[PDB]
Amino acid sequence: STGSATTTPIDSLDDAYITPVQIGTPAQTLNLDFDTGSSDLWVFSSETTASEVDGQTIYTPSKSTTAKLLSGATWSISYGDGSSSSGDVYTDTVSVGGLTVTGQAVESAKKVSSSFTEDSTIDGLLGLAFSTLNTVSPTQQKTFFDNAKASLDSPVFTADLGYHAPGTYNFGFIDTTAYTGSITYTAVSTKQGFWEWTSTGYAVGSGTFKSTSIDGIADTGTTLLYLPATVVSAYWAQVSGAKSSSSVGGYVFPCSATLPSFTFGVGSARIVIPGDYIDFGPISTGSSSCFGGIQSSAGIGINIFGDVALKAAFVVFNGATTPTLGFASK
Numbered sequence: 001s002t003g004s005a006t007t008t009p010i011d012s013l014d015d016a017y018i019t020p021v022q023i024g025t026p027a028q029t030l031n032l033d034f035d036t037g038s039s040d041l042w043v044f045s046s047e048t049t050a051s052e053v054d055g056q057t058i059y060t061p062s063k064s065t066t067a068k069l070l071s072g073a074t075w076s077i078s079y080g081d082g083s084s085s086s087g088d089v090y091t092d093t094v095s096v097g098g099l100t101v102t103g104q105a106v107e108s109a110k111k112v113s114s115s116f117t118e119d120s121t122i123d124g125l126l127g128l129a130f131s132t133l134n135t136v137s138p139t140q141q142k143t144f145f146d147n148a149k150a151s152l153d154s155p156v157f158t159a160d161l162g163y164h165a166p167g168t169y170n171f172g173f174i175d176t177t178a179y180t181g182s183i184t185y186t187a188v189s190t191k192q193g194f195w196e197w198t199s200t201g202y203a204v205g206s207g208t209f210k211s212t213s214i215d216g217i218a219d220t221g222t223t224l225l226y227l228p229a230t231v232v233s234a235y236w237a238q239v240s241g242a243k244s245s246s247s248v249g250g251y252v253f254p255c256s257a258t259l260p261s262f263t264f265g266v267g268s269a270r271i272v273i274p275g276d277y278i279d280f281g282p283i284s285t286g287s288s289s290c291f292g293g294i295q296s297s298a299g300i301g302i303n304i305f306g307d308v309a310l311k312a313a314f315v316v317f318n319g320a321t322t323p324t325l326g327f328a329s330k
């Protein structure tokens, strides 16, 4: 089997991407944030505290003839930005782009934090990291990919995120028309539950490539590119007037600037992030100070190849017995 679904930016800055997902019988379609940095599939629901729902589409398990409460099961998660959600668990039928999993754990939110409430465009998350990170207690549950894997033509999924444009998530096959040149595969460590790999270095604009190992995670659920302070300083030093602002919470730059590209290494291959991918627009409406799309990971504990990096590539999440990651230009 295979599946193929279009993923769409939630706003003009590509702050996140949403992908339609069918849950239950009859289908209830929710727009979920596919997140390769977490392992819970959770949704706004009929159980979510009413004051914490503000325009999201909800899953109503009582209207699904295939929904079954998973007795005694609860979940609770918190993300890097300090947002969180929690609730109870159903199993139900879940389909993505024509690929169907029966008995998928669908984690129904009873509570969500303010950031989730305030984002009307995201109805929940679909985790695609390793199932060892799944938060369901007392019995940990499998991700959609882990449940689908054995049925797939090939045990893989691919992320092809667009810049200011729709893109695609494919399950079970590699669309050889969706990239240029070859896909370069690189080793993954699953020891922290992430698609964790080591980039071979970087360049800023037309500058010389610096060979240096950068361990980080391929994370579709993180908007920006978070890298070591040394690397980030080298990037922003090439932008006149750019500075790290403690008040704003990172590097900002004059909106009149032309940003240089940023290249990262995948083995001997190179992925080039165009400068405009690194522009996240005015810090507040009407400001001429713009927020940068490359930021320091110093306060995080891990480097994160988020959407700013991934959208510059066709990315293969290879879930073979020994997982690997593939990157191609496009």
Ligand SMILES: O[C@H]1[C@H](NCC2CC2)[C@H]2CO[C@H](O2)[C@@H]1Sc1ccccc1
Residues within 6 Å of the ligand: 015, 016, 079, 080, 081, 082, 083, 119, 221, 222, 223, 224, 300, 304
């Ligand atoms: O990019 C943000 C995400 N924003 C959601 C998007 C709709 C706007 C969420 C999910 O994860 C964090 O908060 C990351 S920042 C991060 C920081 C430290 C560690 C990991 C990630």
